[PDB]
Amino acid sequence: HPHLLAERISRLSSSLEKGLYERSHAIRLCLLAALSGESVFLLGPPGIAKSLIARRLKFAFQNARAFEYLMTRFSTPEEVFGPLSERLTSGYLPEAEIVFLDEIWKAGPAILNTLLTAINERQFRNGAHVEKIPMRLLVAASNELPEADSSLEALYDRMLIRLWLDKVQDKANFRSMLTSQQDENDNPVPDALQVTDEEYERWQKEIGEITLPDHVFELIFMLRQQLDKLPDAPYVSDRRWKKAIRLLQASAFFSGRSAVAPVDLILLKDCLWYDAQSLNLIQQQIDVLMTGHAWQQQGMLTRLGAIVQRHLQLQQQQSDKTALTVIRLGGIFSRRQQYQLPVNVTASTLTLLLQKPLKLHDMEVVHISFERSALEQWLSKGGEIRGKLNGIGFAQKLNLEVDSAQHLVVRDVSLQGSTLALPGSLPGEIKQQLEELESDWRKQHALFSEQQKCLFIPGDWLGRIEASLQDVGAQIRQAQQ
């Protein structure tokens, strides 16, 4: 039953995207906050699809009412909630579900005071007796930012999601967007994908029952302590941490999961900043946290580097056991041609060890790697050979010659000998530590290879999380060759 819920949500948000290109993040975040009882805020220039998203999410329900209002500097509370006779609230806000308030940073003093009571209590001071407000989604958009010392900051600190919308930049997505024929006032949502009023009241209780894994708490508490030490980092109140969990628990609820997923921390990039200065700071700390401490990205880099350094140190010590013998070949040719090892070596960019280290190019080296396509030509036609040092840099020229006992002597600027050799086919101490680190990478990759189908995750984040996991796997499989 929980597995079939992720399929119904994927089909509901698909019809909402039809008509607004490059706006999937501004629609999927509003649908999750509407089904969980959270708010959302938008910011940007007027004309980047900020009022249509408030009139589009109402079609996904069966008993929703829209309310598009524009707050002015001379607005009165009697024109927002309804004029009194006790207040005629026929189709306004106390009985509505999805309301829209544009330019909220300029309303009257009594208007903002009544909006704070309808959020923490979902009630209203309608005359004498109070009544509940079935508000499911609270969206607000504007253009500029409020003052640093004013009463408008009380509502900004209470809103959870802070969406950062902007104009389009891609050229391919602007072709069909410029000449679109889809109407924005029809009903693109089918009647089979709209939830009922009974399912909404039941889902509000099962969100709080999501367990909190111990591995997830290690990432939430670490991000809180990191922002406290940075002076340029914005301050986050205790209310924001409690309201953010309800958003992450609701994301895993509609994705076929029962616990808080570690990948759900990506949505925290729109719930910590407050201005344009802290926008690039929150997205930078999360990108390092998700690619450094989430699936133990940096935790394995500091462990694999010690294994490779220990492996290369043991290979340059036991080089006297395995040498390098070059076999001859028949045929009729002037220059004495040489043939490499047959099935013993098959790689193209193999590495060659050495006994006594030398100072080549005014620097030390512990291993020299050659090219298989370039080694076969020098051993047959002759000439000069080019090879890099320490696996980095360009293929510099070396003074490599042939030995009387069929070896590879490397000469330097002091006419010193250095017989090359190939590494044998892994010590027991290195293999014991390599299998334990490789098994930990498969366990972390198994968790990511099951929760990546989350609909509430942007597409640009999958290009960096997967690239950070494949980079470690491509390096750990090279030392075991």
Q: Nearest distance from residue 122's CB to a second copy, in Å?
A: 8
Per the CB < 8 A criterion, the answer to whether 64 and 58 are in contact is yes
Q: Nearest distance from residue 473's CB to ligand ADP, in Å?
A: 38
The first and second tokens of residue 173, run together, are 């997505």
242: Cβ contacts below 8 Å, ≥ 6 apart: none
Per the CB < 8 A criterion, the answer to whether 444 and 295 are in contact is yes
419 forms beta bridges with 409
DSSP state of 254: T
Q: Does 157 bind a second copy (CB under 8 A)?
A: yes
Q: Nearest distance from residue 207's CB to ligand ADP, in Å?
A: 17
Q: Which is nearer to ligand ADP, 47 or 331 (CB)?
A: 47
Burial (0-12, 13-18, 19+ Cβ within 10 Å), 137: buried
Q: What are phi and psi of 143, to 5 degrees?
A: -155, -55
Q: What are phi and psi of 313, to 5 degrees?
A: -75, -35
DSSP state of 291: I
Q: Which is nearer to a second copy, 144 or 460 (CB)?
A: 144
Q: Does 167 bind a second copy (CB under 8 A)?
A: yes
Per the CB < 8 A criterion, the answer to whether 247 and 267 are in contact is yes
110: Cβ contacts below 8 Å, ≥ 6 apart: 77
Q: Nearest distance from residue 100's CB to ligand ADP, in Å?
A: 9
DSSP state of 49: S
Q: Which is nearer to ligand ADP, 73 or 242 (CB)?
A: 242
d(CA 78, CA 84): 7
Q: Nearest distance from residue 50's CB to ligand ADP, in Å?
A: 3
What H or E segment, with its residue span, contains residue 162? strand 161-164
Contacting a second copy within 75-104 (CB under 8 A): 75-76, 79, 90-91, 102-103
Q: Nearest distance from residue 354's CB to a second copy, in Å?
A: 36
Q: Which of 8, 11, 175, 239 binds ligand ADP (CB under 6 A)?
A: 239
Whether the CA torsion 230, 236, 238, 244 is positive or negative: it is negative
Q: Nearest distance from residue 288's CB to a second copy, in Å?
A: 21
Residue 20 interacts with which of a second copy, ligand ADP, none, CB < 5 to 8 Å by class: ligand ADP
Q: Does 177 bind ligand ADP (CB under 6 A)?
A: yes
Residue 38 interacts with which of a second copy, ligand ADP, none, CB < 5 to 8 Å by class: none
Region of 48-56, 368-376, 411-419, 464-472 interacting with a second copy (CB under 8 A): 48-56
Q: Would you tell me the crossing angle of helices 297-315 and 462-476 to the nearest 10 degrees?
A: 20
Q: Which of 3, 73, 321, 335 binds a second copy (CB under 8 A)?
A: 73
Where would I find the H helices in 121-237? 153-156, 172-178, 197-206, 214-229
Q: Residues 46-85 vs ligand ADP: string with x where CB under 6 A?
A: xxxxxxx---------------------------------
Q: Which is nearer to a second copy, 144 or 384 (CB)?
A: 144
Q: Residues 176-195 vs a second copy: string with x where CB under 8 A?
A: -xxxxx--xx----------
Residue 232's closest CA among 281, 290, 300, 276?
A: 281
Residue 352's closest CA among 308, 431, 407?
A: 407
d(CA 383, CA 68): 80
Q: Nearest distance from residue 208's CB to ligand ADP, in Å?
A: 14
Q: Does 112 bind ligand ADP (CB under 6 A)?
A: no
Q: Which is nearer to ligand ADP, 52 or 220 (CB)?
A: 52
Q: Residues 218-257 vs a second copy: string with x where CB under 8 A?
A: --xx-------------x-xxxxxx--x------------
**Site residues (vs ligand ADP, CB under 6 A):** 19-21, 23, 46-52, 168, 177, 184, 238-239, 242
**Site residues (vs a second copy, CB under 8 A):** 45-49, 51, 55, 68-76, 79, 90-91, 102-103, 106, 108-110, 112-113, 116-117, 120-122, 125, 127-128, 144, 149-151, 153-154, 157, 167-168, 171, 174-175, 177-181, 184-185, 208-209, 212, 217, 220-221, 235, 237-242, 245
